[PDB]
Amino acid sequence: EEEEFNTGPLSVLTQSVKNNTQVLINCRNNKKLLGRVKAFDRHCNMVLENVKEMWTEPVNKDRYISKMFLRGDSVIVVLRNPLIA
């Protein structure tokens, strides 16, 4: 199982936790959560730090959330990048 977290597509999350790097999460709510992965699981539940939530309403909006838990079903996409840099 660890092997599948380590080398499979979830290695994106595994890599973000290890390097304390930022990732953008496109989300079902049409919102995007930008931050660092403290923890994750099979379902893509996550505990996130320094989250910048961004969305639109046209008007763009954002808000800072230091500490939060995301239920993984809401995940559409998870992006790793030269974002942290």
């Binding site: 079902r28 709510n29 403290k38 923890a39 994750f40 699981d41 539940n45 996550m46 505990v47 730090e49 959330i65 230091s66 500490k67 939060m68 838990f69 995301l70 239920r71 079903d73 809401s74």
Partner: protein, 82 residues
């Protein structure tokens, strides 16, 4: 690993939860179970496009949760230990 276990440790914390249907829930956790079914007390719940209502107790089916906003104080590194 199983992050629901982490949430199960948060009894007596106060949190804000955003629901899948947009509803916002602020209250004190009395219990999270294995299905992430969450139970609270002293709850101020604001359905999208209403003024808040206060409930002494509220019980949420786990699947209907989008995300929890945790106390800034929360010592995550402690809670992530098993």
């Amino acid at each position: 690993m199983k992050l629901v276990r982490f949430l199960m440790k948060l009894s007596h914390e106060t949190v804000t939860i955003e629901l899948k249907n947009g509803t916002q829930v602020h209250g004190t956790i009395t219990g999270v179970d294995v299905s992430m079914n969450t139970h609270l007390k002293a709850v101020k719940m604001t359905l999208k496009n209403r003024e808040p209502v206060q409930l002494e107790t509220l019980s949420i089916r786990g699947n209907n949760i989008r995300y929890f906003i945790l106390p800034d104080s929360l010592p995550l590194d402690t809670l992530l230990v098993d």
